[model samples]
Target: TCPFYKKIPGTGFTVDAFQYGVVEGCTAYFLTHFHSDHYAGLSKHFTFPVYCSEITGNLLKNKLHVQEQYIHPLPLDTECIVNGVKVVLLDANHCPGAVMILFYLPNGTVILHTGDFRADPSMERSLLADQKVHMLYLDTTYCSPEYTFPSQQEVIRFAINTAFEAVTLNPHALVVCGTYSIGKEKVFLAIADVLGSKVGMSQEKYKTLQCLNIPEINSLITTDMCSSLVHLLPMMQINFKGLQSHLKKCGGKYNQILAFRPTGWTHSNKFTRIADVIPQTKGNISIYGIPYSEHSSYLEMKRFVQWLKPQKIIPTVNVGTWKSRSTMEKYFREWKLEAGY
Candidate 1:
């Protein structure tokens, strides 16, 4: 949902649509998460009040330098009023501080704006279970039958097992994993714990972790490059070229480099066998493109839409043009019809 008419159909509020500039009749701005694509147009020039989860507010202030005076931190699951409209925040499984904005309008309209989420089954057992949703602003990152992947837990287990095996085969190999500013913390945390190795990350990344309140943060991280065998780098720096440059900078302390590229885009269809998740190796460099996603799988989204049965569903992603939106619409219609809607 990059920037296609962010203004709520009947309200003076916008959700993740700052790039459109100051919209007419818009009084308040709502952010669902702190991802770059979602928060694209937000800057210091903005004067309107920005509402988001406490963690996202912190990132806006500390990382993006958004003024604290205009930023409001909404606690999860608490009902609060913004410009006379009732709003509630729910923990979105996409990332830390990510939330699904529930808007209750005066006209008896209940809108559930899922910023970007992994449609876990637990979502069906939420406070919105009983309420009839009028408009569902969905995260349609993977809304087609051609898209499917393993569960997060299963992928995490695969990463940990693969790393363990690689290290066992060659103790001197340097293990590197890609990480975002906020998401994918669980993967590295589990790997570091199982391997008994601290993660070496940038000073800025360490500061960001402090804001997250993760358990045992200090014990699992180190700024010193050589103190830990496992290292964390920005997601873009996990390529072979990047690893080779890192190796040259380290002056040949490690004989080989093993990198993990964890993302949903890597896997398109259902993985039937273990060999399906292959690792590409070139000389001393190996890169594994694991299907670890922060967004819901196609089947998960299908089940969610059927269970919720929102009268209207507005996709947040891939809604650039009519062709794309219509393509996504067929899936919605199929799910709705199958659910006996």
Candidate 2:
């Protein structure tokens, strides 16, 4: 028998049911985020009233190709009832479109599902002061002490400093940092802010950033502007040796070079080795590792879990697999003192 009153598959205690199931008269389903894992079964099995924040709803429609017929956009911090389950959508700091969901039942039992969040004070204060959560389903992506991450601000500062140092060391060199085509415009903007100008962005990137209404920190440049100053190209553009060689040949007198991995390349071994080789391949090419991540770190996950004080924490996103499970367990053990859920 399932522990929870509802019977959602791949959720609650019945882990093997990643398929269709009767949600015990549940008329509404809340999606905490748009990540593939969180909404994996949605289009297939779940067609009920799906509640999500406005931003998440828009993102799902625009980016994930989700149909709009079943989506219900709910304002943040607002409450609604769906098939006897009280629901509230809270912010999740994992991504711009992600959220933490609060479920309050008729019996007064409250449950919070943290889709994915970071330890930023802004994020913590926003959720804690706004919503009252009981049990928390967490996104323990990096729940091990060994996976501790620096603050987002710190990571931005580090990237800025490193890029500045690199450019100063080689003013004529082109600098390229890897980032997600869809989400990392801010990091690039931060770097540009530090550099005192907005650099050229790919057509695709520029359009996407424009959609988000990211303010122009400085004058925008086009790829054609590469002839004027060194270019900072995306990693995908230079993944193959042929492309790298082509760029080098076209670069003429410009020699200084820098590049790093973007968000999705974290699949491991492949991108890191490619980054490592970029610097060695050419005499002027230099690659720097600027630590930046979208998921919550171990400490952040622990802090969020503690703040909620959930009855039983069901780790999502990075759960199930042997490697991810072991990694999460290590973090739980290390920070068991701070974790109340």
Candidate 3:
């Protein structure tokens, strides 16, 4: 019944478009971004038109080969009506084109779907924050205090410096940087600017970089350690044992390969499955996991929840770092001004 996105009694809008399948007899579909999990059931064969950001619309056509006619590209901060539902897009600030969907239902209720975003204090100044959201579809990716890390800007600085230092120590070692398809383009772009070289990426990824329209950031085909200092991979490629295996694979080819997971999971100390590592080469490889997160920390989420005072907070993803809804309820329930008329 949950996760699949049941209707709100009368409003005919369906959100996130379930990964395993589509909602039964959904009227209109709303996509948060092009992240695979959030857009699992989408394909060229999708029947209904989709509502997403402009960049996501491009990705749908270029990457997934979805037909352009079925895609409705919405600009950030703009609202478009689909049937009786009024939908507005806001910058999620997670990736290049991620958006948070705000729904103004015929019932006169406002619903916010925080697709996957970091809660910045500046966003609090936006008009959306002032409204009392009747329902909130929360990201809750880092809903526990243990998941706290420095600001993403701070983590980006650390990543660029660490990668640069690793390359400085071993100019011949190829740095295998793991990132999501569209998530960490900034990190790679920053490193490229520092190294004065382009990242080694696939033709498909290069096309995306072109679409992104960032001048001077570039990439080339992987030939040797000299031509390309950094090799890009999906973020999962740098997980615990996978990191070891990936570097061993690199050792087979060159002097060494430095692997890294620039992700929020690095924030966990007690439950960390990945070990701590420095830039030092281990035989022929070095690995480090940087805590570059796009989700709000527990403290950040608490502040947002308290400020918004949504009637109910529903967790979208069942991540372990997230506490139960009741746990969140205990934190936010008393703040509500009224429960009944």
Candidate 4:
């Protein structure tokens, strides 16, 4: 019997019973990160004993706020056994709690799963250069040849510059940025540093930043008392027109509003309509689009795959669909691995 199998319910596979079933028999199931796509189904459907780096475990518990009962925490970079596989978690450099998994299989196959990794000079180089990977589960969300991503430092500088410019244009402007609840806190801190003053933040966010324990970067404020200087609005409230209308009714000036969105709002056409209603001529409404992503670029993915020299490459996470499969196949062909698999 295969260790993992997919069952086709109709036109496409609907269940992965073999993989789930093996969890009970295997020693452990290793998770690389707390991203929804990577860890969502496992938390609910699979009851097997799961393992991840200590930071990853805490991130699932505190940041993702998952209430799974089957997860077991493991230290980073330490060799451990999971599902009869020897594994180690390497720094992913994509996010605070993200990791790349190095799996040593029993059949003398080494699988390197780069779960949303990035190229950051500050961080340690990934294990792709050192390990002889038989298979590579890569993050190829931006594998299009035309797609190019800026460095994290460059992105941070852009965000800070934009925020600083907005505040300088209007002394009373309240700059608000919307980002992932977990990872983009660093972006906010970088912006605050440019302001040279403490910015307002929610208590929950403050606690999260505290728990992360990054001393060089800290939140501006945690209480409502500091709301006069800067107001921190939740991402949800920023999307609701009723809230904006209420703020306008309270003599809220539009020129004093600056919002940063990590992701462009695409939930519904209603959001677009509401955004259209906001007046931008008076400087009261401004949405700054900052390119902040936790995933690697197309070139980075290609470089990692080429360096690892895996026998077979499997693109996972956001790039696991048929479209991605075709693109990855093209990549493999270019690398002269068409016959490897």
Candidate 5:
């Protein structure tokens, strides 16, 4: 279940869901992003209108099999009053069409929910610090200090160089760029643009990408490729057996295979259950895992809370009780939760 989900007393409703009746009862419902954990229990059985960004709506329609009528698109950084609640959307920086939601309640309290976001500069500017915030629902995916890693851009740079260079070094090697069904399109697309090559996708994934209707992404996806030289496979294809198991059925080839997993787990210490980035070599094939997560690191989370300045913080995921709180007072120095309204 998605623990981040909460009911706002001021509105008598909820954002995000698990079991039924929440969205059905709320005056309105908002979906922060398309990650499965965030939208658990959402299915064709769903009947009410669910609001999200343009890309999110597309993903919901195309990938999740949600009906177009149920997916309402919300504009970023704009307010839409739903059943007397003033709601605004901000970019979450987590995945394509992801967003953070702000609710201005009838009781003068404001609630901000970050749906799996990495607090970045653009998010800061979009926050419009002048408003007072009451509660903050944080994306604490990596709330512990043991999960330090570089910014998403930095990891993308590393992955780009590593994958391409490996392919350049071993002409016969297949550069298997691992990614999820919806997220991490940026990493592979960057590699494609930089190398001046096209990306290979299974027909199903290709169809999903096509319906996304995103020009920058749609242009890179192709159903055809060298079948070995370069391709975008699921995260499962990061090992010899992993790839071999699939290619055996689907039919493809690989040689001197090189792979990578772009994720925050790459920066974790030995005690963390996940390991730090592994830089290729030592066996039949070479591989690397880079930290290209969209969630905030412990330091980033610390700074993000320091800047948001919400009165109370509610974590979206599980963590130790040592919860941190904070933000810039100047952003709300002359404001009150009840002042503007």
Candidate 6:
């Protein structure tokens, strides 16, 4: 069973289920973030009222050109009633605009929609700390045991060290990082700090970040391609051909290129798998698949599940098939049991 079903039970609301266009019983829609997968099928044509964080609203306004009146930007960490159900938004730690939605139904049932969150220790201090969540819509992106990898800090540090060492050998080498519109920022931001280099990105992406209103990132990015040795481009351009084209576009300003394709897809602890955050080099181009994921690892999800011990758990991602959904449920069962639930 797919988790993207267009309705949240016990309420007249839908959470990240815009793909259905408009459900008959839904009165309000909640968007967790501006991620493409979550925002899939959302467009200017959506006339229904949609609620989300301010940053996510801004991205929707600029990117999809959704109507301003229909887009409602809710206050973070503040409770608000929508269609009779109380709702609160908390940072999901997945991306700049991502948030976990807390819903309190009239029946005293508490439900949490974790819209693709990376479980951080600080999250335990949120509104979730007090309530006994009855139904949990979890982000099971890395729920499998084999998917566990290094922490975000460790991965970001490894990326910075690798880039710094590469640049040390060749002072003129250009370091490029693959990025989504709003995620994996910590990795490049850290690398920029250690190397003391300004980050260059597309004018469109620069403007997108401007709407995020994070001052530190606004100051670090520039639109000028040649002005900075370190460039942050969309993930698609991290390939060899793309890097080569980018190098040629710069008029051969640098000697070699050190590119990092940061993604969790290339990581696995399984013995059968070979590629686990290794750098693939050919001639002057070196591309490393850095295991930098915004989703929580298996251990992180375990800790969160054990601590929360929700009455019911729902898998959000990788739940297309019954087998896949059952695999994730197995972990939840064990984790809750370990917590003496």
Cα lDDT of all candidates, in order?
A: 0.84, 0.56, 0.69, 0.58, 0.69, 0.83
- Cα lDDT tens digits, model 3, 238-279, are 654565675555545457666766756563545533223355
- Candidate 3's C-alpha runs over 4 A off are 1-9, 18-22, 211-226, 234-256, 266-281, 319-323, 334-341
| Model with the higher TM-score, candidate 2 or 3 | 3
Best-fitting candidate, measured by lDDT?
A: 1
lDDT of 5 by residue, 1-341 (tens): 32334666667456676455554346656777777766777777677778888988887777778887788897888888766678888877777788888888887888888878887755566755777788888777776656776666777777777777776776656666787756777777777776667888788878767755567765577887653245777787777678655445434445466667766555354333223355557454666766677787767766667666678666666644433322222222233342332
Write down the TM-score for model 6: 0.92
lDDT of 3 at 199: 80
Q: 4 or 5: which has the higher TM-score?
A: 5
- Give the C-alpha lDDT of model 3: 0.69
Superposed Cα deviation of residue 7, candidate 1 (Å): 1.5
Worst-scoring 10-residue span by lDDT in model 5? 325-334
For TM-score, candidate 2 versus 4, the one ahead is 4
Q: Whole-model lDDT for model 4 versus the true structure?
A: 0.58
Clashing pairs in 6: none
**Candidate 5: deviation at residue 279, Å?**
3.5
Candidate number achieving the greatest TM-score relative to the actual structure: 1
Q: Which model is ahead, 4 or 6, in terms of TM-score? A: 6
Please state the error at residue 19 of candidate 5 in Å: 3.2
* Residue-wise C-alpha lDDT for candidate 1, range 293-332, written one tens digit per residue: 8999888988888989899988878877888889998888
TM-score of each: 0.93, 0.71, 0.82, 0.74, 0.83, 0.92
lDDT of 2 by residue, 127-208 (tens): 4665565555666666655664445676576667767877777776555655453445556666666665556666665544
Best first by TM-score, ranked: 1, 6, 5, 3, 4, 2
